[PDB]
Amino acid sequence: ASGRALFQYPMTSKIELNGEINGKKFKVAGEGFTPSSGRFNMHAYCTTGDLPMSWVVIASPLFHMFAHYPEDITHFFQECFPGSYTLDRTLRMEGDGTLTTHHEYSLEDGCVTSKTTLNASGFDPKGATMTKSFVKQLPNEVKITPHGPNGIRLTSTVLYLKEDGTIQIGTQDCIVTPVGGRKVTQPKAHFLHTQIIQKKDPNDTRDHIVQTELAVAGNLWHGMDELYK
């Protein structure tokens, strides 16, 4: 049994994330629940003290195999299983710094675990990422296109909302590569609608967040496919 057949709900997740911003090493761990296709959360916490960057900006680094796909588009992220895939991400906060992440996943026992690394340099320490001045990120559409012989590219533009009510943009560009090193059928070009909600549990004493992603794929522009080969 493989691909969609491996994703029977409910499932769960863990994450271990090691990172570094402007020299400040930090670590985050978490666990979460995926009750159904497209709805998945993550209770996460900085295990080294305070998190030295905005929880809003770290939201994207914190599981595309849990997205809901209609039957008429290939669920690439799921079809990579067994074997898994990696994700390389670059996120440019325009006017402020740039950060990268590398993510490995494995799936055992109804639980996806993610080992993730994060590097971030040249951030304005008076800017919103480092002063933690963001409130949330707006929903958006991630564009997914074939990449190389066996990958996909994900691009997006994200609007981050500051406390003062204004927007900072981040541009985001990811590559996903199966590491089952076997052929996985690539999908047509399409979009993944994505929403992130973050809450605090004031019964957790650590620096922490409770995050839900809703993620739905769709053929938003039926024409888009012909532009990609």
Q: Quote the Cα angle for 70-83-116, to 5°.
A: 90
Q: What length does the chain have?
A: 229
The residues, any chain, with a CB within 8 Å of residue 160's CB and separated by 6 or more, are 56, 57, 93, 128, 134, 136, 137, 138, 167, 168, 169, 170
- Sign of the torsion formed by the C-alpha atoms of 127, 51, 143 and 103: positive
- Please give the domain boundaries of the chain with CATH numbers for all domains: 1-229 (2.40.155.10)
Three-state DSSP at 58 gives: helix
d(CA 190, CA 17): 29
Query: Could you tell me which of 78, 111, 107, 105 has the C-alpha nearest to residue 2?
Result: 78
Name the one residue in this structure whose structure tokens are 């024409």: 223
Three-state DSSP at 66 gives: helix
d(CA 171, CA 173): 7
Distances (CA, A) of 103 to 49, 129, 160: 23, 21, 23
47 and 206 in contact (C-beta within 8 Å)? yes
Distances (CA, A) of 46 to 60, 93, 178: 16, 22, 29
Compute the chain's Rg from CA coordinates.
Answer: 17
d(CA 204, CA 47): 12
